[PDB]
Amino acid sequence: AFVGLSDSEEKLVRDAWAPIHGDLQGTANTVFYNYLKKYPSNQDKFETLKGHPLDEVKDTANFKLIAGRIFTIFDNCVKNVGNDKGFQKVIADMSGPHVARPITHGSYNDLRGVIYDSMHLDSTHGAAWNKMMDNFFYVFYECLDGRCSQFS
Ligand code: HEM
């Protein structure tokens, strides 16, 4: 379910993300590369990347576009942590292209893990972050399941 965050937890999320917020594209490029490298089955889900070696595409405009657009969404979710309706709208709006693409929860969860691992959070910040990400995935999966109108 959606579970609201406390005042301190909202603040913890902002602080957790702040290094990434200040280098959004650079962080995105590294994390997206690490994700495709660790979980190579996902590269085929991106038609623009499909059929090339990962090291051949990593320096391309198309790869960086994909990495950046993921991180832009998370940046906007972080922007909206004090606004449940606004946070939910951010997600609802990016959910469409993922609806009925054959991408498993496994795939999305593996991305979440790579993001988490890249942040090297202490357990306090980690817990607040996980509450936000749990909210993210609750909304996202409801929308994938055709229950997005409550959030759109
Ligand atoms: C879970 C975090 C994610 C975020 C924040 C995100 C965000 C986005 C955004 C902003 C779009 C473009 C929406 C539009 O055109 O209006 C998009 C498209 C797309 N996404 Fe994601 N996404 C995520 C996860 C993934 C994963 C894990 C995959 C595959 C494994 C994936 C595959 C795609 C594909 C194939 C497209 C259509 C774009 C294309 O053909 O490249 N996404 N995503």
Domains of the chain (ranges; CATH) run: 6-152 (1.10.490.10)
Technique employed here was: X-ray
Task: Give the C-alpha distances (Å, rounded to integers) separating 57 from 39, 48, 66, 101, 146.
Answer: 15, 9, 11, 22, 33
Resolution of the determined structure in angstroms stands at 1.8
Cα–ligand 1 centroid distance for 121 (angstroms):
25
Residue nearest to atom 15 of ligand 1 (CA): 97
Residues 67 and 10: their CA atoms lie apart, in Å, by 25
Tell me, using a 6 A CB cutoff, whether residue 93 lines ligand 1: no
3-class SS letters over 61-105: HHHHHHHHHHHHHHHHHHHCCCCHHHHHHHHHHHHCCCCCCCCCH
